Amino acid sequence: TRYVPYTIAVNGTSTPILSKLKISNKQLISYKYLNDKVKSVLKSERGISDLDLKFAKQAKYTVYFKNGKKQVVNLKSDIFTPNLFSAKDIKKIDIDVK
Amino acid sequence: IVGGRRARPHAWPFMVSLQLRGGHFCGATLIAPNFVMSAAHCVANVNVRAVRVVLGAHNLSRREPTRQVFAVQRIFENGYDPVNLLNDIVILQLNGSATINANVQVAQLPAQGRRLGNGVQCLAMGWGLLGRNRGIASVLQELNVTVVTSLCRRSNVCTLVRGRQAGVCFGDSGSPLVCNGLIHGIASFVRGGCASGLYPDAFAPVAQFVNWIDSIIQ
Amino acid sequence: IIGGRESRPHSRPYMAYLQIQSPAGQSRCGGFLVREDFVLTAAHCWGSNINVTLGAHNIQRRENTQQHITARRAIRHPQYNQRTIQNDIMLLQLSRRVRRNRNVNPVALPRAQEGLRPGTLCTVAGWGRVSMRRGTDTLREVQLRVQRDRQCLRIFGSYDPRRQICVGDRRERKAAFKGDSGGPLLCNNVAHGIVSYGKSSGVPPEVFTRVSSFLPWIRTTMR
Ligand SMILES: *[C@@H]1O[C@H](CO[C@@H]2O[C@@H](C)[C@@H](O)[C@@H](O)[C@@H]2O)[C@@H](O[C@@H]2O[C@H](CO)[C@@H](O[C@@H]3O[C@H](CO)[C@@H](O)[C@H](O)[C@@H]3O)[C@H](O)[C@H]2NC(C)=O)[C@H](O)[C@H]1NC(C)=O
Ligand SMILES: *[C@@H]1O[C@H](CO)[C@@H](O[C@@H]2O[C@H](CO)[C@@H](O[C@@H]3O[C@H](CO)[C@@H](O)[C@H](O)[C@@H]3O)[C@H](O)[C@H]2NC(C)=O)[C@H](O)[C@H]1NC(C)=O
Ligand SMILES: *[C@@H]1O[C@H](CO)[C@@H](O)[C@H](O)[C@H]1NC(C)=O
């Protein structure tokens, strides 16, 4: 119910597409939620699967919030803080794999 | 809380719900009439002016006259490290004081430096998800957990439910860990997703920060 | 488009504006009319439903000159590799033929195996962003220099000069940018390239699909 601008960079390369992720604003969401959405478009748009990410040197995304704050979230980590936050507060998400 | 049970109505009258417009996002603990205590990561990125502190709640999905709603007047932290999740504690001063009654009461904190050994039985609680991607709770949940040192760090209090894929989950950040009537933890992080059944949950160790807390609230 | 100028309205009547939707999200790309029933663009613009707008200048206004046609088939190249971004080319078969006029008109494709010497000045056009901070409502364009292949070969592991073009002087702040994907590279009014990929910083050179390398597949697919 809300579309968030996002980019993918793989080893510094990206396609110059204007792209937005659909993410629910029916309830508060979590970083585990965004991990799933991010991994899904890594696979569909750039051929980067779950197992590819085990072998990547770095795999992360940054959530840019409308108030100027940012949160970097490594994809190779299974440590999560169990908090929730609003999809409406996200400005954009930059995904980066190397 | 995954694998818990419903708490008795107002069984834990220090339990706090931090809410945005879209609802409950973290738990907290009332530690004075005008102070609550939560995880620093809960508020790192939020607009603090938009946060509502809800006291005396039980069923978040119903209107409750037991509730007292406050705003945040001021934030206090002490060396929060978001990369290593150390000192994951925040004190929020309220724009007023709660009226203390059967439903809204201040929690008791341990003495500074008190360290819990493995095997100590505690109660976790909160309004977080009931399954590892399922929906947040309406009724406040509680869960019997045990202090473990294995697969932990010295800088945390960790808890496990042996043989059960149970534990805290999204929305439980900030919620108290109650051991022997004292708040010994603040929900801080999980490992391997919620309710892995393998890795304990990690709580900010309240007793390590008691002198700093007393600096603030007295 | 970064570092360019606003196009004279309807001066590039082949330009197509693509709105792509999928269950996962939405995307905006460019493209170009190659026949009354076909638009060419990049494979990485594929999605479940594609809405095409021909005849536009201001894509934020419902201009009378516009024609809105959905894609009946969105045909990625069968060897498109979205990891290496190789064979990044796609044909959109329109659900109806366009009404040809001064504002909606196809662009010519190069001849069989036609190359493009380094140093050649070509033009790319699109409705993409003009900086990290600012978009555009109207069609924009910029002239770019074709580079020797060593420029892309040294920084892009998967660049293939037999199927791609190395474009953009690293010294000039001129490039396609977010939203220009799929737009044409025009040299002497022939669409030699398709906007494909580059460095995420937007620093040149960037890579274009070399249209002339895919003429057999294009002809076979359009028949
Ligand atoms: C699950 O956890 C509950 C509650 O845990 C206790 O209270 C929390 C608030 C924390 O302070 C924890 O550190 C603390 O362990 C356990 O309930 C408790 O059970 C004990 C033993 O059954 C009760 O003690 C008894 O109380 C009766 C009177 O009711 C006396 O006559 C007995 O002599 C004995 O002292 C205790 O009252 C009870 N506490 C509460 C608040 O209900 C529970 O046992 C535990 N269950 C499991 C399976 O671990
Ligand atoms: C501290 O902050 C809390 C949280 O907002 C305040 O509670 C709010 O109190 C007001 C009364 O003062 C309640 O009425 C509302 O007032 C606003 C004007 O501020 C008005 O525009 C509304 O139409 C409404 O009548 C309000 O419902 C209540 N908020 C909640 C969530 O219950 C509290 O007043 C503040 N305390 C101090 C001492 O400033
Ligand atoms: C296609 O056009 C219809 C009609 O206005 C519109 O509802 C839809 O959003 C468009 N499709 C896409 C993928 O943008």
XYZ file of C-alpha atoms and ligand atoms in Angstrom:
641
model
C 0.000 0.000 0.000
C 3.102 2.250 -0.373
C 5.989 2.476 -2.894
C 9.518 3.265 -1.736
C 12.314 4.374 -4.127
C 15.224 1.937 -4.101
C 18.437 1.157 -5.976
C 20.702 -1.873 -6.391
C 24.457 -1.659 -6.870
C 26.519 -4.803 -7.573
C 30.288 -4.240 -7.463
C 29.471 -0.575 -8.009
C 27.372 -1.181 -11.138
C 23.675 -0.464 -11.483
C 21.058 0.012 -14.169
C 19.740 3.625 -14.327
C 16.120 2.628 -13.685
C 13.686 4.628 -11.532
C 12.407 1.874 -9.234
C 10.086 1.674 -6.215
C 9.478 -1.248 -3.838
C 5.925 -2.029 -2.787
C 5.861 -2.282 1.010
C 2.832 -2.584 3.268
C 1.639 0.339 5.365
C -1.257 -1.652 6.862
C 0.880 -2.265 9.969
C 4.325 -1.440 11.280
C 7.160 -3.386 9.631
C 10.539 -4.768 10.704
C 14.027 -5.112 9.286
C 13.389 -8.814 8.819
C 10.447 -7.772 6.614
C 12.687 -5.468 4.578
C 15.388 -8.172 4.339
C 12.865 -10.416 2.586
C 11.758 -7.622 0.201
C 15.375 -6.675 -0.525
C 16.556 -10.227 -1.125
C 13.594 -10.759 -3.462
C 14.520 -7.911 -5.806
C 18.245 -8.784 -5.575
C 17.254 -12.165 -7.042
C 14.675 -11.024 -9.595
C 16.414 -7.885 -10.863
C 20.144 -8.757 -10.576
C 20.359 -12.558 -10.349
C 21.726 -12.456 -6.786
C 20.337 -15.444 -4.868
C 20.457 -16.361 -1.169
C 23.555 -18.553 -1.697
C 25.287 -15.849 -3.766
C 24.975 -13.620 -0.707
C 26.856 -16.133 1.484
C 29.816 -15.724 -0.900
C 29.555 -11.926 -1.334
C 32.275 -9.949 0.442
C 29.682 -7.356 1.511
C 25.874 -7.284 1.227
C 23.934 -4.489 2.859
C 21.193 -1.956 2.402
C 20.683 1.469 3.955
C 17.222 2.704 4.950
C 17.080 6.493 4.544
C 14.382 7.996 6.774
C 12.496 11.196 5.998
C 13.890 12.906 9.116
C 17.484 12.546 7.848
C 18.347 9.455 9.889
C 19.669 6.312 8.215
C 19.985 2.669 9.265
C 22.494 0.322 7.647
C 21.388 -3.312 7.753
C 23.793 -6.079 6.751
C 22.152 -8.911 4.845
C 24.764 -11.474 5.872
C 23.762 -11.079 9.549
C 21.008 -12.977 11.355
C 21.171 -10.600 14.365
C 17.989 -8.497 14.519
C 16.763 -5.859 16.890
C 13.082 -6.778 17.586
C 11.652 -3.297 16.960
C 8.979 -2.035 14.537
C 8.726 1.210 12.539
C 6.483 2.822 9.927
C 6.844 2.310 6.192
C 5.519 5.871 5.800
C 8.742 7.250 7.343
C 11.130 5.700 4.780
C 12.531 8.043 2.142
C 14.524 5.525 0.075
C 16.559 2.306 0.298
C 19.979 1.814 -1.324
C 21.056 -1.834 -1.723
C 24.743 -2.592 -2.221
C 26.488 -5.918 -2.857
C 30.234 -6.404 -3.508
C 6.319 -12.856 22.236
C 6.351 -16.219 20.447
C 5.185 -19.227 22.420
C 4.034 -17.301 25.482
C 0.656 -16.810 27.098
C -1.612 -13.876 27.845
C -0.733 -11.903 30.945
C -3.409 -11.358 33.558
C -4.973 -7.906 33.064
C -2.559 -5.369 34.596
C -0.416 -8.105 36.101
C 2.646 -5.960 35.243
C 1.655 -2.339 35.946
C 5.118 -1.000 35.039
C 4.719 -2.311 31.484
C 4.701 0.472 28.882
C 3.773 0.599 25.212
C 5.623 3.039 22.982
C 3.407 3.931 20.057
C 3.531 5.882 16.851
C 0.393 6.757 14.908
C 0.484 3.306 13.261
C 0.550 1.587 16.664
C 2.840 -0.125 19.135
C 6.486 -0.285 18.036
C 8.438 -0.993 21.260
C 7.961 -1.777 24.936
C 9.315 0.184 27.900
C 9.380 0.166 31.705
C 8.112 2.868 34.042
C 10.942 3.620 36.462
C 9.606 6.849 38.019
C 6.355 8.813 37.785
C 7.897 10.922 34.953
C 10.479 8.514 33.468
C 10.337 5.343 31.410
C 13.208 3.116 30.261
C 13.523 1.378 26.842
C 16.103 0.280 24.264
C 18.197 2.990 22.620
C 17.741 1.327 19.235
C 13.941 1.711 19.543
C 14.186 5.519 19.209
C 17.446 5.975 17.269
C 15.633 6.754 14.027
C 12.107 7.790 15.067
C 10.662 11.270 15.337
C 10.616 11.578 19.125
C 7.892 14.252 19.025
C 5.525 11.684 17.452
C 6.078 9.043 20.176
C 3.288 8.352 22.672
C 4.045 6.619 25.967
C 1.050 4.522 27.028
C 0.782 3.432 30.677
C -1.778 1.095 32.216
C -2.591 -0.808 29.010
C -3.501 -4.444 28.538
C -5.449 -5.058 25.324
C -3.985 -2.650 22.785
C -6.903 -3.255 20.429
C -9.551 -1.851 22.822
C -10.147 1.529 24.425
C -8.997 1.363 28.034
C -9.707 4.067 30.651
C -6.887 2.575 32.739
C -4.505 4.151 30.204
C -2.434 7.267 30.747
C -0.792 8.708 27.632
C 2.252 10.964 27.754
C 4.676 12.586 25.369
C 8.480 12.599 25.615
C 10.059 15.739 27.076
C 13.719 14.674 26.905
C 16.044 11.776 26.000
C 18.997 10.417 27.985
C 21.496 7.862 26.726
C 24.887 6.646 27.942
C 27.329 5.476 25.278
C 24.954 3.676 22.925
C 26.879 1.720 20.284
C 24.550 0.641 17.431
C 27.268 -1.354 15.626
C 27.986 -3.672 18.576
C 24.639 -3.159 20.415
C 26.333 -2.143 23.654
C 24.648 0.089 26.266
C 21.370 -0.376 24.384
C 19.425 1.698 26.912
C 17.464 4.962 26.790
C 15.580 6.940 29.437
C 12.625 9.032 28.221
C 11.433 11.826 30.481
C 7.671 12.331 30.297
C 5.991 15.719 29.807
C 4.260 15.047 33.117
C 3.960 12.464 35.844
C 1.782 9.382 35.927
C -0.832 9.059 38.625
C 0.145 5.894 40.500
C -2.667 3.367 40.938
C -3.289 -0.382 40.767
C -2.782 -0.246 36.999
C 0.201 2.139 36.767
C 3.160 1.603 39.097
C 6.923 2.078 39.155
C 9.188 -0.945 38.715
C 11.943 -2.009 41.094
C 15.515 -2.120 39.713
C 18.423 -4.278 40.935
C 21.497 -2.920 42.655
C 24.365 -1.757 40.466
C 26.612 -4.515 39.153
C 24.401 -7.450 40.208
C 25.009 -10.257 37.694
C 22.589 -13.143 37.138
C 23.932 -16.687 36.866
C 22.647 -19.276 34.447
C 19.505 -21.052 35.569
C 17.805 -18.002 37.060
C 14.149 -18.054 36.043
C 12.732 -14.825 34.583
C 9.614 -13.528 32.847
C 9.791 -11.812 29.475
C 6.747 -9.878 28.258
C 5.551 -7.556 25.513
C 3.153 -6.776 22.667
C 5.404 -8.034 19.874
C 4.564 -10.596 17.215
C 3.032 -13.923 18.254
C 4.846 -15.836 15.498
C 8.067 -15.206 13.702
C 6.326 -13.184 10.977
C 2.743 -13.322 12.407
C 0.775 -10.376 13.831
C 1.540 -8.202 16.864
C -0.279 -8.998 20.074
C -3.435 -7.294 21.231
C -3.324 -8.705 24.776
C 0.017 -8.327 26.577
C 1.952 -11.619 26.519
C 4.356 -13.152 29.017
C 6.889 -15.957 28.709
C 8.891 -17.992 31.208
C 12.563 -17.835 30.204
C 15.857 -18.952 31.782
C 19.141 -17.049 32.089
C 21.895 -18.754 30.102
C 25.542 -17.852 29.707
C 26.307 -20.229 26.841
C 26.047 -18.582 23.417
C 25.897 -15.218 25.216
C 28.224 -12.232 25.754
C 29.385 -10.816 29.064
C 27.884 -7.473 27.993
C 24.333 -8.932 27.849
C 21.825 -10.897 29.888
C 20.665 -13.765 27.672
C 17.609 -15.985 28.012
C 16.367 -19.211 26.480
C 13.346 -21.532 26.552
C 14.900 -24.984 26.364
C 13.694 -27.146 23.517
C 11.019 -24.617 22.446
C 11.051 -22.227 19.493
C 9.858 -19.419 21.770
C 11.167 -15.958 22.620
C 10.790 -12.241 22.003
C 9.883 -10.997 18.546
C 9.353 -7.817 16.561
C 7.783 -5.186 18.782
C 9.300 -6.598 21.959
C 12.385 -4.340 21.775
C 12.568 -2.234 24.930
C 10.388 -4.505 27.073
C 11.540 -5.474 30.587
C 12.939 -8.812 31.719
C 11.640 -9.417 35.239
C 13.725 -11.665 37.524
C 12.924 -11.966 41.239
C 10.673 -8.932 41.051
C 13.471 -6.788 39.599
C 13.900 -5.445 36.054
C 17.213 -7.056 34.993
C 16.938 -6.695 31.220
C 15.720 -4.570 28.332
C 14.951 -6.571 25.168
C 17.758 -5.757 22.754
C 18.358 -8.364 20.006
C 17.606 -11.875 18.698
C 19.815 -14.217 16.675
C 18.745 -16.495 13.828
C 15.380 -14.715 13.610
C 12.742 -14.724 16.351
C 12.288 -17.924 18.369
C 15.178 -19.792 16.739
C 15.120 -22.414 19.460
C 18.928 -22.410 19.191
C 20.277 -18.978 20.186
C 19.167 -17.123 23.339
C 17.591 -13.679 23.237
C 19.776 -10.799 24.400
C 18.742 -8.133 26.892
C 20.577 -4.946 27.816
C 21.890 -5.642 31.352
C 19.989 -3.111 33.519
C 22.071 -3.725 36.677
C 25.176 -2.497 34.842
C 23.496 0.908 34.330
C 21.803 1.435 37.715
C 24.111 4.260 38.881
C 23.566 6.130 35.601
C 19.796 5.604 35.824
C 19.801 6.961 39.386
C 21.810 9.940 38.086
C 18.886 10.711 35.791
C 15.651 10.005 37.635
C 16.366 11.142 41.215
C 19.673 12.936 -18.006
C 22.605 14.639 -16.165
C 24.306 17.736 -17.575
C 22.000 18.080 -20.587
C 19.312 20.357 -21.972
C 15.537 20.274 -22.365
C 14.526 18.826 -25.744
C 12.524 20.915 -28.173
C 8.996 19.524 -27.636
C 8.151 16.666 -30.031
C 11.578 16.882 -31.730
C 12.190 13.182 -30.948
C 8.799 11.692 -31.881
C 10.063 8.101 -31.379
C 10.663 8.562 -27.630
C 8.553 6.235 -25.463
C 7.817 6.629 -21.747
C 7.344 3.314 -19.950
C 5.476 2.701 -16.697
C 6.149 -0.829 -15.497
C 4.342 -2.599 -12.668
C 4.900 -5.978 -11.001
C 3.676 -7.511 -7.728
C 7.023 -6.365 -6.261
C 6.892 -2.665 -7.219
C 6.882 -0.062 -9.985
C 9.464 1.241 -12.415
C 9.854 4.037 -14.940
C 11.976 3.591 -18.098
C 12.437 5.023 -21.565
C 12.204 3.341 -24.952
C 11.816 4.139 -28.621
C 9.352 3.357 -31.419
C 10.923 1.173 -34.125
C 7.712 0.248 -35.979
C 4.102 1.298 -35.578
C 3.530 -1.850 -33.497
C 6.875 -2.112 -31.625
C 8.920 -0.284 -29.003
C 12.537 -1.223 -28.212
C 13.954 -0.871 -24.691
C 16.120 -2.703 -22.159
C 15.387 -6.148 -20.762
C 15.973 -4.866 -17.247
C 12.769 -2.772 -17.661
C 10.604 -5.914 -17.911
C 7.578 -6.376 -15.641
C 4.089 -7.890 -15.596
C 2.274 -4.894 -17.131
C 3.839 -2.082 -19.137
C 2.043 1.110 -20.068
C 3.617 2.992 -23.008
C 3.210 6.736 -23.769
C 4.179 8.050 -27.216
C 4.036 11.686 -28.239
C 4.870 13.154 -24.837
C 6.963 16.118 -23.859
C 5.720 16.871 -20.308
C 4.941 13.421 -18.869
C 3.309 15.092 -15.838
C 0.629 16.695 -18.069
C -2.023 14.918 -20.115
C -0.946 16.460 -23.395
C -3.269 16.140 -26.380
C -0.395 14.795 -28.480
C 0.013 11.701 -26.273
C -1.023 8.155 -27.186
C -1.349 5.599 -24.373
C -0.934 1.960 -25.375
C -0.303 -1.072 -23.230
C 2.277 -3.673 -24.173
C 0.673 -6.869 -25.441
C 3.989 -8.759 -25.211
C 7.174 -7.765 -23.358
C 9.845 -9.953 -24.990
C 13.219 -9.999 -23.223
C 16.112 -11.407 -25.221
C 16.155 -15.171 -24.456
C 19.808 -14.973 -23.237
C 19.370 -11.846 -21.106
C 21.530 -12.295 -18.005
C 20.433 -9.943 -15.283
C 23.589 -10.509 -13.171
C 26.147 -9.622 -15.889
C 23.552 -7.383 -17.629
C 24.384 -9.004 -20.964
C 21.926 -9.135 -23.891
C 20.013 -6.286 -22.197
C 17.407 -5.705 -24.900
C 13.632 -6.074 -25.050
C 10.842 -5.618 -27.575
C 7.394 -4.338 -26.590
C 4.662 -5.404 -28.987
C 1.972 -2.762 -28.651
C -1.659 -3.760 -28.075
C -2.553 -1.553 -31.048
C -0.600 0.227 -33.766
C 0.198 3.874 -33.116
C -1.425 6.637 -35.165
C 1.553 8.063 -37.027
C 1.855 11.870 -37.087
C 4.396 14.637 -36.500
C 4.485 13.765 -32.773
C 4.603 9.924 -32.940
C 7.029 8.425 -35.467
C 9.514 5.491 -35.465
C 13.305 5.902 -35.467
C 15.586 4.089 -37.880
C 17.899 1.280 -36.706
C 21.502 0.854 -37.917
C 22.496 -1.513 -40.685
C 23.704 -5.096 -40.160
C 26.817 -5.181 -37.926
C 27.226 -1.400 -38.128
C 29.862 -0.111 -35.740
C 30.498 3.222 -34.092
C 33.983 4.721 -34.035
C 35.331 6.073 -30.740
C 35.149 9.851 -30.708
C 31.723 9.966 -32.405
C 29.335 12.409 -30.714
C 25.874 10.873 -30.134
C 22.793 11.956 -28.184
C 20.833 10.168 -25.482
C 17.403 11.411 -24.359
C 15.010 10.563 -21.547
C 12.820 11.617 -18.624
C 15.263 10.452 -15.940
C 16.597 12.452 -13.029
C 19.014 15.345 -13.541
C 20.939 14.893 -10.275
C 20.726 12.991 -7.014
C 18.124 15.549 -5.865
C 16.075 16.726 -8.859
C 13.886 15.066 -11.468
C 12.357 16.375 -14.673
C 8.818 16.705 -15.973
C 9.856 17.171 -19.627
C 12.035 15.311 -22.098
C 15.756 16.124 -21.850
C 18.831 15.189 -23.874
C 22.631 15.315 -23.813
C 25.441 14.644 -26.279
C 27.992 12.004 -25.282
C 31.261 10.858 -26.823
C 31.777 7.236 -27.798
C 34.863 5.882 -26.034
C 37.456 3.328 -26.998
C 36.466 -0.027 -25.530
C 39.415 -0.090 -23.113
C 37.516 2.489 -21.040
C 34.708 0.069 -20.248
C 36.858 -3.074 -20.448
C 38.986 -1.882 -17.556
C 36.167 -1.078 -15.109
C 33.250 -3.396 -16.080
C 34.089 -7.089 -15.628
C 31.403 -8.249 -18.066
C 31.583 -5.592 -20.797
C 31.496 -7.178 -24.265
C 32.393 -4.827 -27.140
C 30.778 -7.185 -29.646
C 27.335 -6.507 -28.114
C 27.745 -3.233 -26.172
C 28.990 0.341 -26.577
C 31.279 2.301 -24.264
C 29.904 5.835 -24.026
C 30.760 8.992 -22.122
C 33.869 11.044 -21.476
C 34.869 10.499 -17.852
C 35.934 14.189 -17.691
C 32.421 15.535 -18.458
C 29.513 15.495 -16.002
C 27.132 14.178 -18.670
C 25.296 10.874 -18.443
C 22.039 9.041 -18.498
C 20.658 8.672 -14.979
C 17.745 7.142 -13.064
C 14.753 6.803 -15.376
C 16.679 6.983 -18.635
C 17.106 3.164 -18.797
C 16.034 1.819 -22.199
C 16.270 5.166 -23.977
C 18.108 5.383 -27.303
C 21.582 6.476 -28.221
C 21.117 8.457 -31.467
C 23.972 8.990 -33.907
C 23.069 10.831 -37.119
C 19.393 10.141 -36.243
C 19.913 6.347 -36.071
C 19.304 4.509 -32.773
C 22.675 2.761 -32.262
C 22.376 2.125 -28.500
C 20.028 1.330 -25.633
C 20.718 2.782 -22.162
C 21.839 -0.229 -20.127
C 24.122 0.243 -17.131
C 26.918 2.212 -15.575
C 28.566 2.958 -12.263
C 26.128 3.714 -9.455
C 27.892 7.051 -8.893
C 26.823 8.185 -12.376
C 30.480 8.841 -13.313
C 31.120 8.058 -17.024
C 31.741 5.912 -19.045
C 28.455 3.988 -19.187
C 27.391 0.947 -21.201
C 24.774 0.854 -23.976
C 23.421 -2.260 -25.650
C 24.675 -2.160 -29.250
C 21.438 -2.375 -31.284
C 23.165 -3.528 -34.490
C 24.475 -6.691 -32.773
C 20.862 -7.822 -32.244
C 19.304 -7.072 -35.642
C 18.763 -10.786 -36.493
C 16.899 -11.318 -33.184
C 14.986 -8.032 -33.631
C 13.838 -8.899 -37.168
C 12.959 -12.472 -36.193
C 10.964 -11.255 -33.190
C 9.062 -8.493 -35.009
C 8.810 -10.416 -38.329
C 6.896 -19.000 35.378
O 7.131 -17.732 36.001
C 6.234 -17.450 37.084
C 6.570 -16.060 37.566
O 7.974 -15.919 37.740
C 8.231 -15.243 38.985
O 7.704 -13.942 38.922
C 8.277 -13.074 37.929
C 7.504 -11.751 38.041
C 9.792 -12.936 38.151
O 10.003 -12.291 39.362
C 10.450 -14.340 38.187
O 11.808 -14.217 38.576
C 9.759 -15.229 39.198
O 10.298 -16.495 39.055
C 6.379 -18.503 38.183
O 5.363 -18.253 39.149
C 5.825 -18.391 40.501
O 5.823 -19.759 40.870
C 6.346 -19.976 42.185
C 6.490 -21.469 42.364
O 5.329 -22.150 41.913
C 5.408 -19.336 43.199
O 5.958 -19.491 44.502
C 4.977 -20.099 45.372
O 3.963 -19.163 45.771
C 2.929 -19.746 46.597
C 1.778 -18.727 46.787
O 1.149 -18.437 45.510
C 3.600 -20.203 47.925
O 2.634 -20.799 48.787
C 4.737 -21.219 47.638
O 5.400 -21.615 48.858
C 5.737 -20.689 46.601
O 6.550 -19.689 47.253
C 5.256 -17.850 42.906
O 4.231 -17.295 43.723
C 4.902 -17.593 41.444
N 4.974 -16.170 41.165
C 4.034 -15.508 40.489
C 4.273 -14.036 40.306
O 3.037 -16.076 40.031
C 6.215 -19.908 37.612
O 6.520 -20.882 38.603
C 7.118 -20.121 36.394
N 6.849 -21.417 35.790
C 7.774 -22.177 35.193
C 7.287 -23.480 34.637
O 8.952 -21.832 35.109
C 1.750 15.413 27.608
O 1.497 14.788 26.333
C 0.276 14.035 26.332
C 0.223 13.226 25.051
O -0.278 13.962 23.943
C -0.899 14.991 26.500
O -2.104 14.230 26.491
C -3.108 14.942 25.728
O -3.753 15.897 26.559
C -4.734 16.702 25.892
C -5.259 17.664 26.932
O -4.282 18.610 27.345
C -5.834 15.812 25.308
O -6.775 16.605 24.586
C -6.306 17.061 23.291
O -5.657 18.346 23.380
C -5.164 18.867 22.130
C -4.337 20.152 22.394
O -3.000 19.826 22.858
C -6.391 19.137 21.232
O -5.968 19.691 19.972
C -7.214 17.843 21.000
O -8.415 18.157 20.262
C -7.532 17.075 22.309
O -8.705 17.685 22.903
C -5.249 14.702 24.440
O -6.269 13.779 24.076
C -4.140 13.955 25.187
N -3.510 12.975 24.318
C -3.768 11.663 24.384
C -3.039 10.806 23.398
O -4.562 11.189 25.205
C -0.759 15.772 27.805
O -1.752 16.791 27.888
C 0.627 16.424 27.935
N 0.809 16.940 29.283
C 1.271 18.163 29.562
C 1.399 18.496 31.016
O 1.564 18.969 28.681
C -1.947 1.410 -17.508
O -2.989 2.380 -17.663
C -4.051 2.185 -16.730
C -5.188 3.090 -17.154
O -4.985 4.435 -16.737
C -3.521 2.485 -15.335
O -4.572 2.244 -14.405
C -2.316 1.605 -15.006
O -1.722 2.051 -13.789
C -1.265 1.588 -16.139
N -0.323 0.499 -15.926
C 0.882 0.649 -15.367
C 1.713 -0.597 -15.258
O 1.286 1.740 -14.966
